[PDB]
Write a protein that binds this ligand. Structure first.
Ligand SMILES: NC(=O)c1ccc[n+]([C@@H]2O[C@H](COP(=O)([O-])OP(=O)(O)OC[C@H]3O[C@@H](n4cnc5c(N)ncnc54)[C@H](O)[C@@H]3O)[C@@H](O)[C@H]2O)c1
Ligand SMILES: NC(=O)c1ccc[n+]([C@@H]2O[C@H](COP(=O)([O-])OP(=O)(O)OC[C@H]3O[C@@H](n4cnc5c(N)ncnc54)[C@H](O)[C@@H]3O)[C@@H](O)[C@H]2O)c1
Ligand SMILES: O=c1ccn([C@@H]2O[C@H](COP(=O)(O)OP(=O)(O)O[C@H]3O[C@H](CO)[C@@H](O)[C@H](O)[C@H]3O)[C@@H](O)[C@H]2O)c(=O)[nH]1
Ligand SMILES: O=c1ccn([C@@H]2O[C@H](COP(=O)(O)OP(=O)(O)O[C@H]3O[C@H](CO)[C@@H](O)[C@H](O)[C@H]3O)[C@@H](O)[C@H]2O)c(=O)[nH]1
Lengths: 340, 340
């Protein structure tokens, strides 16, 4: 039994109050589903900028009526200090996921990304701190590694940001560290590495590669590969990311004011992904015979990204049990039902 | 003749349009005085948050009526993108000084500091970029060195921030670098090291050590030393900082998208400063016989700060001609006239 498995068993016995910002988004709604199923009490904050009411509706259809009543939802904005203080009222653990992802988005509109990702992040720290919360866990990013080529990726060795988005995610780490030095408010930042799974928005022009591609194959549209397709990623199935969050939310002091890489330590080239998704969809009765259409590399894009999760395994007892294949197998059916 | 001296002679012959944000503040009004005297055209942006109309009035009394008419003032906020675009209209060189200094201030109120220092800074980059400006120079800070003990300070070796303020100043560098990578908008950031001189506000609870102490001695109040007084600084007289600004605003491409240390490479302990100011005031007919009152170190304060200006001397031809003594001698008379 891993530390998470035992935690899964302990939580329902000693229920706590959790706060999930960006609860209507991909990662947020998944965290919600898991916590409500662990009979925890959850408060959610979201403004629907990129999240959806359907994500909340889907969760309700997946959890028991009782567990769903343990959920309090607040339609607010983390850029509004009032909404933050409100969402942190009497909360035990904060899981901050509210943000505006997508490098391309931040590049053609750095101001809008800055407002939520940095101002909003800072408001949450103050509100969480002032609410005397027990723990604060926030979504960081592997983009912080920037240009630095070296592999695997180690937490202490980072490169220079390659985009506005990357800057904001790195600033979340900076402010987190300072709040620890100046107020003794320790946090735990999780550097996610390409998370995927159910409820990750396939629509919009900034959709992630997996949702975008899976959606396109089901619809029979062309699939675009930015570059030669040799670009590699450490795709982390949602379930592994959920584990890290709960783990960080309840870690010992020795593990606080620390940032961790959250992935599986695997390497998947975009070319492998194309076939993984296509074959995965084929097992579900979806035929796709189109070849991938290769176009130019995308700006502010990283070449390779492999994570060393030994720090997370060692200090948090993080033990991911889902490789890309398992995740893809679990995800594909969902998208087919979503697009039907 | 230094590169600045020749630049002093060249500018009046080929006048350019300059933009100074925070033009009503200490460093900003001094830059204004110098530029107007070099017969340059200047646009100023300020909201008087910490600046003063008197600083502008003093400048008017110091420059010719003709040179003063070459000045356009805009009462605006860099947090307002409209005001930024307005201030950058048809501008050649941008000297961004608008910000909210003071570590103590950012510590007891990180949100207010974040808004101006990061959001406002980002708006200026966009507006300067969209206005097709020829150069963008911004006020950085030696605080970016943070904890790192090593001396002298070298631009490539920085430590971890010790306060919210330090974070914002470091983020100005981050966004500046990214704007160079993504838009080809190169900038030059100047890491100032404790600037002082005429018009540096002696009032308020966040006043810098020199203005605060000088003011207190003239008034006959007690002088407080936070710590043992062995805390050392590289006090940089305003005139040296002005040189760096104009130098950076007109530097060759090889010098762009680069950050520089701006000081004199000198080391002055707070204990030496106490006597430098007191003796300096004594030469002007001001008697002070009180001994300094030592109290606890101030939070988010750096122990020692010495700068290696060789990078600035080498790439910008920076050649400061004012040590603390000269600066103090020039400053003291001003404060005596200000408090009278
Ligand atoms: N998905 C990945 O692979 C990945 C990788 C690295 C980091 N992250 C981070 O994980 C977090 C969640 O990502 P996600 O993929 O679930 O995206 P998502 O867009 O599905 O979730 C983000 C949610 O935050 C909400 N939000 C945005 N701005 C808000 C504001 N100002 N006030 C209130 N709510 C606001 C949105 O409505 C949305 O529901 C983000 O912070 C992101 O930066 C994700
Ligand atoms: N003085 C030093 O020793 C020192 C050291 C390192 C960095 N700096 C930097 O130099 C710059 C100028 O410092 P200064 O000592 O002349 O301070 P100052 O307070 O005298 O000047 C700052 C000016 O900016 C204006 N301002 C602030 N927020 C604004 C906003 N949101 N919109 C428009 N105007 C705004 C203020 O009204 C003020 O006049 C600052 O950016 C500071 O961070 C100064
Ligand atoms: O239609 C498409 C979409 C994407 N890609 C490529 O696939 C790779 C991955 O795309 P993406 O899912 O956007 O990954 P990232 O650029 O690593 O961004 C991920 O990681 C970022 C920082 O960690 C987060 O902000 C994003 O939410 C998350 O998608 C990139 O090389 C893209 O160029 C394609 O080839 N074709
Ligand atoms: O009444 C006083 C005021 C200050 N100090 C000390 O004197 C030193 C210098 O004070 P200060 O002038 O506030 O210097 P910094 O803390 O280095 O801040 C300077 O450098 C910062 C970052 O570079 C800028 O934000 C500020 O505007 C600028 O004052 C510090 O150790 C203070 O503790 C005293 O002992 N007594």
């Amino acid at each position: 039994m891993s530390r998470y498995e035992e935690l899964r068993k302990e939580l329902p016995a000693q229920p706590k109050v959790w706060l999930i910002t960006g609860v209507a988004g991909f990662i947020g709604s998944n965290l919600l589903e898991t916590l409500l199923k662990l009979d925890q009490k959850v408060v959610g904050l979201d403004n629907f900028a990129t999240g959806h009411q359907r994500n909340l509706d889907e969760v309700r259809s997946l959890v028991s009526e009782k567990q769903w009543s343990n959920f309090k939802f607040i339609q607010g904005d983390i850029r509004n200090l009032d909404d933050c203080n409100n969402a942190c009222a009497g909360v035990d653990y904060v899981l901050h996921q509210a943000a505006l992802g997508s490098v391309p988005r931040s590049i053609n509109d750095p101001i809008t990304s800055n407002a939520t990702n940095i101002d909003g992040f800072l408001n949450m720290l103050i509100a969480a701190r002032d609410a005397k919360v027990q723990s604060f866990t926030y979504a960081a990013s592997s983009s912080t590694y920037g240009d630095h080529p070296g592999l695997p990726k180690v937490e202490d060795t980072i490169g220079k940001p390659l985009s506005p988005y990357a800057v904001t995610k790195y600033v979340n780490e900076l402010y987190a560290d300072v709040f620890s030095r100046c107020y003794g408010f320790s946090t735990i930042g999780l550097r996610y590495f390409n998370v995927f799974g159910r409820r990750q928005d396939p629509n919009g022009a900034y959709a992630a590669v997996i949702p975008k591609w899976t959606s396109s194959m089901i619809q029979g549209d062309d699939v675009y590969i930015n570059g030669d397709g040799e670009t590699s990623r450490d795709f982390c199935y949602i379930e592994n990311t959920v584990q890290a969050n709960l783990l960080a939310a309840t870690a010992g002091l020795d593990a606080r004011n620390q940032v961790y890489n959250i992935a599986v330590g695997g390497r998947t080239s975009l070319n492998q992904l194309f076939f993984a998704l296509r074959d995965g969809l084929a097992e579900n009765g979806v035929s796709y015979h189109r070849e991938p259409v290769y176009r130019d590399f995308r700006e502010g894009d990283v070449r390779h990204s492999l994570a060393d999760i030994s720090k997370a395994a060692k200090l948090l007892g993080y033990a991911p049990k889902y490789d890309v294949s398992a995740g893809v197998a679990l995800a594909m059916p969902w998208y087919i039902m979503f697009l039907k």
